[PDB]
């Protein structure tokens, strides 16, 4: 087909997503892998994972746009703390680009947000999900304090995800921060490069913890290897779940397998996301609109490296069957502060709309 802007697209139904991508970029992302982008990527997962094979259809419809359609229900469950901001930012687009369903909107927005992160893959995007569903039940969202067994069961019950696909999905923590785990601090990064879709998160979770970014008594949080922060540049935070998956016999070698393996990590993430994005639907009933997802920002191609103040001697390895790669260490006697803003500054508030959530 060919859209009203000369863009030759695969199917005419995909044309509507072009003006949406531009609107999302201009209004809330500003072509960067910042605050608003991170929040939308998180929403993609929270919307999709609320489904259960054992409990049946009444438990939730998966990637159905339920968070936007029933803003006063799910956003208020304990496990969805902080999701309100992304819901209120997306609702305005639902009302404007009214030919696109709330469900399609959520998945597409995530694909657009991710493309702003250097090193991220170009996600597959299928369209045609219904604009009608039910509000999901509480308890279907995994939490930081959950055990690996509980986490693995949840993903299996949601869509038959194997442990490999579960760890692959966690590559998203390479461009993630926390605002609710500790109420005394904001935007605590999970890795030293929160604006880069690289393999640092896999490396940094394997280092010995030496302190905490803020309080040391938070549910679902364990000691961090790079806790130093100053002003707006908050220190690195480490979640119990990420730590637990890095050391459990079932997932340890998978987790290590991604260290310094950029192409492998990105490809595996893309694959896992293809399954996640269609939970609650039959992919044979959705149109392929992948050619409408923006081309992702390229990375520099540099290898993973130990951040300043850490080295090979600080590793807590759990995979007995695989040799850990030889990586270099960045020079410096002390830990470098992790930048709060993608431009290096400490002042960069993302656009935020008020809404029902
Ligand atoms: C075992 C599963 C997971 C657990 C327990 C988990 C837990 C968390 C927690 C506690 C936060 C901090 C939120 C806050 O306090 O502000 C977070 C943030 C985030 N997570 Fe996960 N996560 C999981 C899986 C995933 C997956 C599969 C995705 C998406 C593909 C994802 C994407 C994100 C992103 C992008 C953020 C950052 C939000 C921001 O920077 O504002 N997570 N996650
Ligand atoms: C999907 O459902 C939503 C929720 O009912 C629809 O949203 C309304 O859209 C109109 C414009 O078309 C706005 O004036 C309303 O205010 C919206 N309602 C809310 C609560 O935001 C949306 O139009 C529907 N879209 C499709 C493609 O069916
Ligand atoms: Ca949902
Ligand atoms: Ca990163």
Contact indicator for 306, 260 with CB cutoff of 8 Å: no
Tokens 């299996």 -> residue: 156
3-state secondary structure (DSSP) of residue 292? helix
Query: 349: exposed, middle or buried (C-beta count within 10 Å: 0-12, 13-18, 19+)?
Result: exposed
Strand 287-288 to strand 221-222: parallel, antiparallel, or no bridges (unpaired)?
Answer: unpaired
H helix runs in 50-145, sequence order: 66-69, 84-96, 102-114
φ, ψ at 174 (rounded to 5°) = -80, -15
C-alpha–C-alpha distance, residues 167 and 195, integer Å: 20
C-alpha–C-alpha distance, residues 175 and 171, integer Å: 8
Show Cβ contacts of residue 85 under 8 Å, excluding neighbours closer than 6 positions.
39, 352, 357
For the chain, which residues make up each domain, given as ranges? 11-141+273-300, 142-272+302-342
3-state secondary structure (DSSP) of residue 178? strand
C-alpha–C-alpha distance, residues 275 and 271, integer Å: 7
φ, ψ at 260 (rounded to 5°) = 60, 25
φ, ψ at 152 (rounded to 5°) = -60, -40
C-alpha–C-alpha distance, residues 286 and 280, integer Å: 12
Identify the residue whose C-alpha is closest to ligand 2 atom 4: 69
Nearest ligand 1 atom to the CA of 273 is 30
Q: Is 94 in the pocket of ligand 2 (CB under 6 A)?
A: yes
Contact indicator for 333, 230 with CB cutoff of 8 Å: no
Count CA atoms closer than 13 A to 83's CA, side-chain side: 24
Give domain 11-141+273-300's CATH number out of 3.40.225.10, 1.10.760.10, 1.10.10.10, 1.10.520.10.
1.10.520.10
Show Cβ contacts of residue 219 under 8 Å, excluding neighbours closer than 6 positions.
144, 145, 181
Tokens 């069961």 -> residue: 153
Show Cβ contacts of residue 26 under 8 Å, excluding neighbours closer than 6 positions.
none
The ligand minimizing its distance to the Cα of 132 is 2
Q: Which run of H or of E encompasses 168?
A: helix 163-169
Contacts 24+ apart (CB under 8 A), 341-347: 341/34, 341/232, 342/32, 342/33, 342/34, 342/195, 346/231, 346/232, 346/233, 347/232
Which residues face 329 on adjacent strands?
A: 306
Identify the residue whose C-alpha is closest to ligand 2 atom 21: 95
CA dist list (Å): 295 to 53, 57, 291: 34, 35, 9
Identify the residue whose C-alpha is closest to ligand 2 atom 5: 69
Mutation to probe ligand 2, out of 20, 87, 96, 98 (largest number of atoms < 8 A from CB): 98
Closest of 102, 109, 269 to residue 198, by C-alpha: 269
Catalytic residues: 46
Give domain 142-272+302-342's CATH number out of 3.40.640.10, 1.10.420.10, 3.30.750.210, 1.20.1250.20.
1.10.420.10
- Name the token pair of 205: 């979770």
Closest of 273, 148, 269, 260 to residue 204, by C-alpha: 260
Resolution for this model in angstroms, one decimal place? 2.0
Pocket of ligand 1 (CB under 6 A): 38-39, 41-42, 45, 82, 142-144, 151, 169-170, 172-173, 176-181, 239, 241
For residue 320, the tally of other CB atoms under 10 A from its CB is 8
For residue 259, the tally of other CB atoms under 10 A from its CB is 21
């Amino acid at each position: 087909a060919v859209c009203p802007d000369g863009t030759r697209v695969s199917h005419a139904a995909c044309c509507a997503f072009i003006p949406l991508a531009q609107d999302l970029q201009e209004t809330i992302f500003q072509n960067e892998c910042g605050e608003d982008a991170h929040e939308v990527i998180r929403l993609t997962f929270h919307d999709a994972i609320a489904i259960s094979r054992s409990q049946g259809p009444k438990a939730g419809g998966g990637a159905d746009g339920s968070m936007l359609l029933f803003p006063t229900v799910e956003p208020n469950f304990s496990a969805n703390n902080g999701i309100d901001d992304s819901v209120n930012n997306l609702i305005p687009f639902m009302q404007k680009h009214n030919t696109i369903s709330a469900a399609d909107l959520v998945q597409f927005a995530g694909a657009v947000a991710l493309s702003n992160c250097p090193g991220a893959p170009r996600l597959e995007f299928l369209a045609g999900r219904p604009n009608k569903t039910i509000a999901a039940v509480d308890g279907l969202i995994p939490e930081p304090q959950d055990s690996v067994t509980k986490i693995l069961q949840r993903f299996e019950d949601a869509g038959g995800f194997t442990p490999f696909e579960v760890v692959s999905l966690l590559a998203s923590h390479s461009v993630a921060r926390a605002n609710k785990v500790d109420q005394t601090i904001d935007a605590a990064p999970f890795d030293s490069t929160p604006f880069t879709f690289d393999t640092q998160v896999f490396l940094e979770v394997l280092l010995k913890g030496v302190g905490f970014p803020g309080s040391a008594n938070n549910t679902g949080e364990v000691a961090s290897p790079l806790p130093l922060g100053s002003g707006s540049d908050t220190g690195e935070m480490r979640l119990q779940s990420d730590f637990a998956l890095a050391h459990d016999p079932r997932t340890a070698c998978i987790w290590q397998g991604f260290v310094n393996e950029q192409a492998f990590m990105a490809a595996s993430f893309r694959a896992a996301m293809s399954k996640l994005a269609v939970l609650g639907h039959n992919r044979n009933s959705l149109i392929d609109c992948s050619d409408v997802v923006p081309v992702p920002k390229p990375a520099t191609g540099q290898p993973a490296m130990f951040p300043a103040s850490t080295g090979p001697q600080d590793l807590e390895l759990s995979c007995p069957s695989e040799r850990f790669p030889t990586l270099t260490t960045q020079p410096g006697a002390s830990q470098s502060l992790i930048a709060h803003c993608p431009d290096g500054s400490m002042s960069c508030p993302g656009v935020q709309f008020n809404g029902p959530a």
